Amino acid sequence: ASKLRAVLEKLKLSDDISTAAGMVKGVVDHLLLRLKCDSAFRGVGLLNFDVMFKLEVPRIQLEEYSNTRAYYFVKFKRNPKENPLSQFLEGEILSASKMLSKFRKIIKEEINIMKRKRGGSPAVTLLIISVDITLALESKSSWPASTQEGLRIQNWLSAKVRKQLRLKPFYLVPKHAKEGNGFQEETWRLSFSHIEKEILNNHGKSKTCCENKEEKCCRKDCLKLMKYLLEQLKERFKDEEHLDKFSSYHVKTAFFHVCTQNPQDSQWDRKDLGLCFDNCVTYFLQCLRTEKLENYFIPEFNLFSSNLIDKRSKEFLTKQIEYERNNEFPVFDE
């Protein structure tokens, strides 16, 4: 626990943000106005680095692509008078690739530097400090059926809170599902990143959790230490390529499942940081070992499927995390 707090303090040194928070916001506010000048993106807005540009399209018709519960076709009638989105249409299907092409195009045309990310990234990444800008369609309708059994927060947060969250919009990002050989350029993937950030900043059973010195839980610390553990092993195994499929979103997903398993705030008492971090570490090990990491909002989408991450990669990380646990986490030294 002394080492774990030493790492958190080592990760706390990074006031560079207060000046860099006003830096990236200047660029986002710029591209937010120039994009509003294009007919197709007049009506784009900031959702509430990883940035999300939302664009509400009324009466979006969704069609679950294949049997995957997360990727969808966006059906859209051409007829709506003066449609600025007709350039992205192919019959009834609203192409995710086409809209992302022109979205990337306009951003690149604004000079006042990008680099394509690995195959499938729905974002536009701008280096200056690194930024991620993702286009997202906004639907104010009910969440798709694949999310019916997701968001298992009833015993942690309230059932009251789940009903409120599921009344909020959901989003689709131009992340395409793979056809094995290549991708399906028309499909979008669901995104609940706005809900993800609500449950992280309002994370306790008590509404006043972390609002006073009596109720300082260590939930955020455990996720920080979980994210940092994966970041460090991936850096040491940089040229390994076995850890390239594992991202901090896997860690975040696993952390959410542990929160559902430990709903009480006394299970995250900061007097037990080492024990709470170990709960996160062991649950993530079972996920690798059983090859199962359900999406928190889409239960039947397995992030640890062999279709996405091979069995060799999962066991390789299992060996490394088991080592780090068995030796008081040496990667947290210095």
Ligand SMILES: Nc1nc(=O)c2ncn([C@@H]3O[C@@H]4COP(=O)(O)O[C@H]5[C@@H](O)[C@H](n6cnc7c(N)ncnc76)O[C@@H]5COP(=O)(O)O[C@@H]3[C@@H]4O)c2[nH]1
């Ligand atoms: N800024 C940003 N927002 C996204 O939603 C997103 N989704 C993917 N990516 C990047 O595209 C590439 C393709 O990975 P793939 O999609 O096949 O598996 C992805 C994806 O299935 C899943 N995932 C990541 N972010 C999300 C997310 N917000 N919602 C659901 N699933 C996600 O975890 C895997 C690894 O993600 P990252 O390694 O952090 O960056 C990925 C990756 O480099 C994203 N980048």
Ligand SMILES: [Zn+2]
């Ligand atoms: Zn708390």
